[PDB]
Design a binder for this molecule. Structure first.
Ligand SMILES: COc1cc(-c2cncc(-c3ccc(C4CCN(C)CC4)cc3)c2C)cc(OC)c1OC
Ligand SMILES: COc1cc(-c2cncc(-c3ccc(C4CCN(C)CC4)cc3)c2C)cc(OC)c1OC
Ligand SMILES: COc1cc(-c2cncc(-c3ccc(C4CCN(C)CC4)cc3)c2C)cc(OC)c1OC
Length: 287
């Protein structure tokens, strides 16, 4: 049989230290191709090792197609091939788009759904998985209004990489180095912190009574761009600051409920934070 492997790379949709992401075409179908830099090879290996352990398949997890290693003259080329989401990342989408109640809830409940799927151990099934780099750039928007979680290059697996998380989204126990590193639940609680920040980013863009906030990243008012580890530790650990809840949210029942939820993702005590499954249930009862 013919094994068609050619992918036509059509346009670069992302560049960073990790390498590049391309929109590509295979057999007439759009695919996303992440080409890894040499500096971030361990992210390709970790995501590949995870998918070789468990073939995750969930509507709110970016769909895996392939991991490719190709020998070159002097180097190894590493590609991750996934489904392609033409609307781009949530970070991208929120810059330019405002939301109503239904679209805001649909976005955040779809993220919580993907996260709870990662976190849960299923017997027979999947290991429990923590993401460790959840943020709005690692969430893609689908045409049906739901999102999917991307980038399992830092993921950790549990059954009963010199890359670190994005500093802006790091939980207090990561910044003050008290995280209980031998304890899998620790990693879930770091994801919940980051989820609460994403929930704040999205809620700001929900219109109520003709008002909306501009897109800002978490802690935009208290740290520089590309904040240092120390910048973050002073804000989050020493001063114990949290993102602002605008007064206008308290006129809207949805944003009032979302403010309470994001508060219960941001407790200093990691074991006080809500679980992804409890966040889902709360979101199903809003509106
Ligand atoms: C190697 O590399 C790539 C391969 C492909 C690809 C292309 N055509 C057909 C296939 C295929 C799938 C599955 C079987 C099965 C059939 C059932 N039988 C009982 C066992 C074997 C055979 C063939 C694949 C996997 C795409 C790629 O990119 C999109 C590849 O590059 C990453
Ligand atoms: C990697 O990705 C894609 C792959 C393919 C593709 C190409 N040839 C063959 C297959 C296939 C056939 C048959 C089985 C068997 C498995 C066991 N049993 C005997 C029943 C069924 C498995 C696999 C596939 C899945 C198509 C794709 O898109 C349409 C892919 O997505 C980009
Ligand atoms: C986060 O992580 C991964 C993401 C993806 C991925 C999948 N669909 C669509 C995209 C995308 C398309 C288009 C834009 C637009 C944004 C506005 N403007 C700047 C032009 C371009 C942005 C994003 C991406 C980036 C693939 C991945 O691997 C193959 C990822 O890594 C796991």
């Amino acid at each position: 049989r013919t094994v068609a492997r050619d992918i036509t790379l059509l346009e670069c949709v992302g560049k960073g230290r990790y390498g590049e992401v391309w929109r590509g075409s295979w057999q007439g179908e759009n695919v996303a191709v992440k080409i890894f830099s040499s500096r971030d090879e361990k992210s390709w290996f970790r995501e590949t090792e995870l998918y070789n352990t468990v073939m995750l398949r969930h509507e709110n997890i970016l769909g895996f197609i392939a991991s490719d290693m190709t020998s070159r003259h002097s180097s190894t080329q590493l590609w991750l091939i996934t489904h392609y989401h033409e609307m781009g990342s949530l970070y991208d989408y929120l810059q330019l788009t405002t939301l109503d109640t239904v679209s805001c809830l649909r976005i955040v409940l779809s993220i919580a759904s993907g996260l709870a799927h990662l976190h849960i151990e299923i017997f027979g099934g999947k290991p429990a998985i923590a993401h460790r780099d959840l943020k709005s750039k690692n969430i893609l928007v689908k045409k049906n209004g739901q999102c999917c979680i991307a980038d399992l290059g830092l993921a950790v697996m549990h059954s009963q990489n010199p890359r670190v998380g994005t500093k802006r989204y790091m939980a207090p126990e990561v910044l003050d180095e008290t995280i209980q590193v031998d304890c899998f639940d620790s990693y879930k609680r770091v994801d919940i912190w980051a989820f609460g920040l994403v929930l704040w980013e999205v809620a700001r863009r929900m219109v109520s009574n003709g008002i909306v906030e501009d897109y800002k990243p978490p802690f935009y008012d208290v740290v520089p761009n590309d904040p240092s580890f120390e910048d973050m530790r002073k804000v989050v650990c020493v001063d114990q600051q949290r993102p602002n809840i605008p007064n206008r949210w308290f006129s809207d029942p949805t944003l009032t409920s979302l403010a309470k939820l994001m508060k219960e993702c941001w407790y200093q005590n990691p074991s006080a934070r809500l679980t992804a499954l409890r966040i889902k249930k709360t979101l199903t009862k809003i509106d």
